[PDB]
Amino acid sequence: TSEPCQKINVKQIAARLLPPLYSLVFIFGFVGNMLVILILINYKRLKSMTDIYLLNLAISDLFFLLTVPFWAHYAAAQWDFGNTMCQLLTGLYFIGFFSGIFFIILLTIDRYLAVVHAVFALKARTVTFGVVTSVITWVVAVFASLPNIIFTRSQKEGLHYTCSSHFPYSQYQFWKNFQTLKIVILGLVLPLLVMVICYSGILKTLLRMKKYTCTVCGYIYNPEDGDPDNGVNPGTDFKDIPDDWVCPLCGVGKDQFEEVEEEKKRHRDVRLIFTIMIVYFLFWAPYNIVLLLNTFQEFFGLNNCSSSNRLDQAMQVTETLGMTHCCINPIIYAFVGEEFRNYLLVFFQKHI
């Protein structure tokens, strides 16, 4: 009677599953992000605001990764590292976390500016400003992580040692809400808002009439002013040109025309930033949602032993999913980015 509510199964299962998984994550993630950092510094050489944010984003994953072996051991045994190591690692973890989403947001805005406000982005997308922005962003990520550090302590809980947050019981539900909202607003609402705003500005610009160029002679078809002396009314989409039409200079068919470099590069640069952002929401939105359910479990009537145990299973599964994300971004670069896969090939050629 009046005993704590046991999640004895959930714990014991977690102790077997998580350590190898986190180990695999730490393996793939470390070599993946180290590779990314090596390529950005030595092969792409950091020449733009984008390379700077991609660099910092990889650094963000490494802060996260450095803590993973410890969480892996914690799951496998208990908290053997003492309190100061508990507060430190919790700090690194949330710094990794917040800086992670902040640079994804900065990537999104940096590309937004390039596509929608091209003229303003001239002096604004200076590498200089990329750097100061990154510095400020790290500072902020740290202040955002401070409360989590201070609320977190190692303690002996009967037989086992833990590393956990505790909130003062006098303002218990206040702090729970504060901490949960801080994670959910910054980790979910804010980047959704950015995504929505930015991608309506970008899709707008993106589906405007695209310029094409002849592969043989290099003639450029500008949709804005068509081609009058050969019967093509200005403002005609290249698709809307009669098929019997040929290149005014060399006379090849539309079959030998491609999109101009600046247009395909733009399509590529938008595909990258989009994939990163939504893959982020794939791996982390479940955790945020379950975090909301737990914090207001009394509101949903989930605050009993049996219900909260199912809630706890969900929480651990989705937290773990989120944890695996710190190895996903290099994988994305390998299957989405043409720049990375090629530089990776040169990386191996340089090994021979």
């Binding site: 009677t1 009046s2 005993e3 704590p4 509510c5 046991q6 999640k7 959930v10 714990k11 977690a14 998580l18 969480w71 914690y74 799951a75 508990c86 690692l89 919790t90 973890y93 989590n148 609320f151 977190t152 303690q155 002996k156 809980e157 009967g158 037989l159 833990t162 590393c163 956990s164 947050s165 505790h166 909130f167 019981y169 218990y172 702090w175 729970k176 901490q179 949960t180 801080k182 994670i183 975090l291 737990n294 914090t295 479990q297 009394e298 605050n303 009993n304 032993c305 909260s308 706890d312 299973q313 929480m315 651990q316 937290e319 944890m323």
Partner: protein, 68 residues
């Protein structure tokens, strides 16, 4: 909302009505911030775990004792 694996931690949904024999209590800990309810857990010489209300005067007095 904190470091990983807080889901693995136990929570209280009831509090003991009357103070336990001070003689029989060995240690104490607070339940995780993940928990719906704030709670103190006392462990006994017999290593039973019993949830108590942190707001109660006897509980805070018990906690103060275990520090000294």
């Amino acid at each position: 909302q904190g470091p990983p694996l807080m889901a693995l931690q136990s929570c209280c949904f009831a509090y003991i009505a009357r103070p336990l024999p001070r003689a029989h209590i060995k240690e104490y800990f607070y339940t995780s911030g993940k928990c719906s309810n704030p709670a103190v857990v006392f462990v006994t010489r017999k290593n039973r775990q019993v949830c108590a209300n942190p707001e109660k005067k006897w509980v805070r007095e018990y906690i103060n004792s275990l520090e000294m």
